[PDB]
Design a protein. Structure first.
Lengths: 8, 340, 340
């Protein structure tokens, strides 16, 4: 549904 | 099919793109030239002729496709990839496009294989829980272009029978405004700038404008954007469209029956009042339109922004048989003169 | 079933100017598929795989060798690019996508995708920067992939299941261009020079071929470039393209059956008109190609731009049986001659 993709 | 006649009809509905019309007439004619009597040549692997349109916003891409469908005898489709979800998800699937093509051809396989395909907003599928409208759409479309027979249930399925309609014979027109495609081309063409006396120094913008920048594009430049090289390999043809011309803006408001001037004219004719637009006001509008960098679509802003006071005050006003718009009106310093 | 001599001729038909590269890929692919037919029924078990690593200039036909091979071999092929690749979990990409791409050719492969081939482009872009998600880190992830393993892959995207596919059997061909590698090997093997008086200057930029130096390339030189020796150990086979030649470009348009010159010739055969391409016109295309530093890839732009006027007017024109092209026409100062 919702993708929480984050990279430091 | 005549390249001289197809260009004459498109000239009626489209203006400002002379080079692009020549490209479409050649590619379109080469597409049908192969289907009717082609693939009977001494040399094998005749390259499939395709089209890849590229232009800014309001460049008339939709109009060119539409004008072709009306002129052309076979059917035409307008299938964007904004909602094309792969693997049969809730949004949509690529198979429906094949289905919609048959509806236009009335389940005629012999007539549907000779059809044309056009897609808008192809930049949105550029590769970046899961991704549904990303690079996945390229994979499904890739099979459609390279060539493959698919299975479509006739009438949706009452048996499990499908129609094995070919796809290598159908033409495809991938076109959409590519945002940011100018900085990438700028790096290659600029090749730095000299600092000494003899070396020439570039100004703010001499060759960095959208016009004369896409013609020198290459397939490797699109790879950095996000597209797949195999997808671009199947479309060796490219069509570069100029942003706009000052003279075309004056013609778009006078020759087309759907011009904005004629629209507002009928809006006031029902009220029992006449309207007029002098030539000095038309050319002034074109200078302000190009500054907005939006195209013909952003032309209504300049018109209604000027006729706001003219339309708001109008109903209360009486004995105003005709209204004249002077060049000063576009500037906004002087109000339009009223005729009693 | 095929042999190295038979495949050499087929490769020669579509590729030229690369003799050593043909023998390398021929014996490599020949012995690779021999291992699949025999499997491990012989005394020897777990027959090791031999990978291939190509190094050559840009537009030197590296991709064509892999594409033409897939047509004759008939096995599935994919063209992956390593520029987007990122180090295990970052915004750009993950290695998992590559595995599904190969299956995407047929979308259903259990004992059929193991025998497929894969190509990689721009391998030098991931060189270990020594000042990382772009550098060395990416190479570490590919080690286990090339060595052979199994990755879960949803077939067709969908079941509540995933299919396991081996990758030891799957051969990999890492293609790429290593610019500036001549300086590293020159000081090591031939001579330390280029800056001194007695030292040889780089006068032979185009007079002589850098290729000959690349033939003496070794894995130790690749370590200084940035690659990991462990990564190069998995790819013992080495292929070195020498250069592209002006006379070769003339042969590229005449010797290959799929030459662009022959496609237009076949296009007008059904039309009942003859086509011609003089030798004085092909040499000019070679100069324009080298001028844009693109090779054979930037060839259609020169041809299609020149024949746009002739092709557009050919259907309109009548009683024309032959077309002649001259060197002046390529420059754009002349119009091609027409014979009735
Ligand atoms: N070449 C053109 N000639 C005449 N009017 C045009 C032309 N291009 C655009 N217009 C006008 O602008 C309106 C919108 O044009 P569109 O072709 O829809 O713009 P567009 O750039 O194709 O939209 P996108 O970017 O594909 S969503 C048309 O209804 C016309 O009134
Ligand atoms: N011997 C050849 N005959 C015909 N075309 C060639 C030949 N060598 C290269 N090409 C052209 O080069 C293009 C492929 O270039 P490619 O090998 O992908 O460049 P790179 O080596 O940088 O990957 C193809 O479009 C093909 O037409």
């Amino acid at each position: 549904x919702x993708x929480x993709r984050x990279x430091x | 099919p005549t390249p001289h006649e197809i260009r004459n009809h498109l000239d009626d509905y489209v203006i400002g793109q002379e080079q692009a019309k020549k490209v479409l007439a050649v590619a379109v004619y080469n597409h049908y030239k192969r289907l009717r009597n082609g693939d009977t040549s001494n040399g094998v692997e005749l390259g499939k002729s395709n089209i890849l349109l590229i232009g800014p916003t309001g460049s008339g891409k939709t109009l060119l496709a539409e004008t072709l469908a009306r002129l052309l005898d076979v059917p035409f489709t307008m299938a964007d990839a904004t909602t094309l979800t792969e693997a049969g998800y809730v949004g949509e699937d690529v198979e429906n496009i094949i289905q919609k093509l048959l509806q236009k051809s009335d389940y005629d396989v012999q007539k549907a294989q000779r059809g044309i395909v056009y897609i808008d907003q192809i930049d949105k599928i550029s590769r970046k829980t899961r991704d549904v409208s990303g690079e996945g759409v390229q994979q499904a479309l890739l099979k459609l272009i390279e060539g493959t027979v698919a299975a479509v249930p006739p009438q949706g399925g009452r048996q499990q029978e499908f129609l094995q309609v070919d796809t290598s014979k159908i033409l495809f027109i991938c076109g959409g405004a590519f945002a940011g495609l100018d900085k990438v081309i700028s790096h290659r063409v600029e090749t730095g700038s000299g600092i000494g006396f003899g070396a020439t120094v570039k100004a703010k913008s001499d060759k960095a404008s959208e016009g004369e920048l896409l013609a020198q594009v290459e397939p490797e430049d699109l790879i950095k954007f996000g597209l797949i090289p195999e997808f671009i390999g199947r479309l060796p043809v490219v069509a570069t469209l100029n942003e706009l011309s000052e003279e075309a803006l004056i013609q778009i408001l006078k020759e087309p029956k759907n011009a904005l001037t004629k629209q507002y004219q009928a809006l006031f004719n029902l009220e029992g009042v006449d309207l007029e637009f002098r030539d000095e006001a038309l050319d002034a509008i074109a200078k302000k339109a190009m500054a907005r960098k939006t195209g013909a679509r952003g032309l209504r802003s300049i018109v209604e922004a000027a006729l706001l006071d003219t339309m708001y005050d109008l109903p209360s006003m009486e004995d105003v048989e005709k209204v004249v718009i002077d060049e000063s009106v576009i500037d906004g310093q002087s109000e339009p003169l009223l005729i009693y």
